[PDB]
Amino acid sequence: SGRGK
Amino acid sequence: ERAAMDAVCAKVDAANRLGDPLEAFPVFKKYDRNGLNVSIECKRVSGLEPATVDWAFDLTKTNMQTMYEQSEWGWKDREKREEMTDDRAWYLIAWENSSVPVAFSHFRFDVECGDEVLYCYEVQLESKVRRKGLGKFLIQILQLMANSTQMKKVMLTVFKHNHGAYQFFREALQFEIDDSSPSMSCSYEILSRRT
Numbered sequence: 323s324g325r326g327k
Numbered sequence: 328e329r330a331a332m333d334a335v336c337a338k339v340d341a342a343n344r345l346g347d348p349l350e351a352f353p354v355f356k357k358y359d360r361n362g363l364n365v366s367i368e369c370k371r372v373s374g375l376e377p378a379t380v381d382w383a384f385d386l387t388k389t390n391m392q393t394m395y396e397q398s399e400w401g402w403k404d405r406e407k408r409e410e411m412t413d414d415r416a417w418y419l420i421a422w423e424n425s426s427v428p429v430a431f432s433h434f435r436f437d438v439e440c441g442d443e444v445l446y447c448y449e450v451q452l453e454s455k456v457r458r459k460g461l462g463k464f465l466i467q468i469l470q471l472m473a474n475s476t477q478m479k480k481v482m483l484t485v486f487k488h489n490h491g492a493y494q495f496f497r498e499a500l501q502f503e504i505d506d507s508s509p510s511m512s513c514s515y516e517i518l519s520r521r522t
């Protein structure tokens with residue numbers, strides 16, 4: 323879920 | 328320097344012009360195990376009915392809002408809705424009996440750390456269809472699409488406090504911790520599986 327760095 | 332990025336971008340741009348990335352793979356458009364009778368479609372978000380996008384956003388919020396607030400990110404409706412409705416968003420949608428949406432993935436073909444990747448932004452199942460192998464099947468579809476478009480990996484973000492999903496990806500699907508993950512230099516890990 324989502325797009326982290 | 329620009330030449331290497333151009334070859335990577337050409338592959339991404341071509342994948343994003345596809346019509347039906349699953350056209351060649353009808354066997355992956357049905358999942359009929361463990362009491363399910365699902366049909367699976369792959370569409371750009373522009374091809375989805377608004378009520379389908381609403382269902383997908385609502386399922387993500389139901390499943391994830393608390394875990395977002397437990398992370399450093401927080402949950403904001405607008406940010407997530409904008410991410411889910413970006414023109415670059417692709418969707419796999421699982422329809423039980425070809426009629427009731429029960430699971431989806433939001434994914435993209437993109438560049439990440441200089442590589443052509445399939446980035447899995449969501450995999451979300453309704454509770455009643457969990458632990459029946461459908462999630463694993465959807466990720467296998469992503470892996471197949473990554474191969475068929477010449478991406479180098481499938482990538483995703485998983486919260487450390489999302490214990491069940493972390494085990495699903497790390498143990499059942501044998502995803503690795505990607506070199507871009509914060510742990511390789513935080514409440515999440517970046518995971519990947521090479522093509």
Ligand SMILES: *C(=O)CCSCCNC(=O)CCNC(=O)[C@H](O)C(C)(C)COP(=O)(O)OP(=O)(O)OC[C@H]1O[C@@H](n2cnc3c(N)ncnc32)[C@H](O)[C@@H]1OP(=O)(O)O
Pocket residue numbers: 323324390447448449450451452453456457458459460461462463464483484485486489490491492494495499
């Ligand atoms: C962002 O979106 C990147 C992904 S992390 C967010 C994942 N989504 C959620 O957390 C939302 C709620 N959960 C789901 O949508 C699904 O349950 C998952 C997507 C996490 C997993 O899909 P599934 O339930 O269909 O899993 P299966 O394919 O049936 O599982 C196969 C095997 O993986 C292990 N598994 C799955 N779930 C597990 C949990 N909670 N705990 C521990 N292990 C888990 C099992 O080995 C499982 O095999 P069986 O034991 O034979 O069932």
Ligand SMILES: [N]
Pocket residue numbers: 326327507508509517
């Ligand atoms: N990252």
